[PDB]
Amino acid sequence: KRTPFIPESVKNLKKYDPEDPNRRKLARDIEAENGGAGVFNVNLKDKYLLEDDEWKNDIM
RNA sequence: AUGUUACCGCAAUAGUAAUUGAACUUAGUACGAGAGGAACAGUUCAUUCGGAUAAUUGGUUUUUGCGGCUGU
Structure with a gap:
């Protein structure tokens, strides 16, 4: 069994004008x-995305 | 050379002032019936010139620095 995978956020997005x-x-x-x-x-x-947004500014 | 010396300077004057191209975008728009197709800006590299430079890349002279070769 196989299905085409379109998430609900794709359909729920309004079309760009x-x-x-x-x-x-x-x-x-x-x-x-x-x-x-x-x-x-x-x-x-x-x-x-991270667990803390302050970790966005942090440095590896 | 203008007593000397030393530093910091000023500037009369002399010379000197970078070549050429295309990559985005402005653009697939202004324009054009279409075919097709901009440019001013704003960014990016290239060619050439000039001046420096040894971090690195590479070449090169003086090495007689280390190890090793071939004898006469």
């Missing part, structure tokens, strides 16, 4: 705030 005053922010949306294409800097430490 490209012309919308009230919508989800994309990466370009946060990107265009401080500078533009090349000069924007990616943050990885903020996003990933």
Whole structure:
């Protein structure tokens, strides 16, 4: 037995509207705030899940 | 050389001031019926020039530093 696996959070997500005053922010949306294409800097430490958010700032 | 000496300086003046390209994005938009297709900005490397440099890479002279070879 095998099934196609689509989680309920996928179906429960609203479709992104490209012309919308009230919508989800994309990466370009946060990107265009401080500078533009090349000069924007990616943050990885903020996003990933940990048991403590202070451990996001901590250093391996 | 202008008493000497020493340091810190100023500047009359002399010369000197980097070449060329493409990678994102601005863009698949302005534009164009389409075909297709920008650029100012903002980032990234390359070529060439100039000046330095030995951390490393590599070459090179003086090694006669260590170990070893081949004799006459």
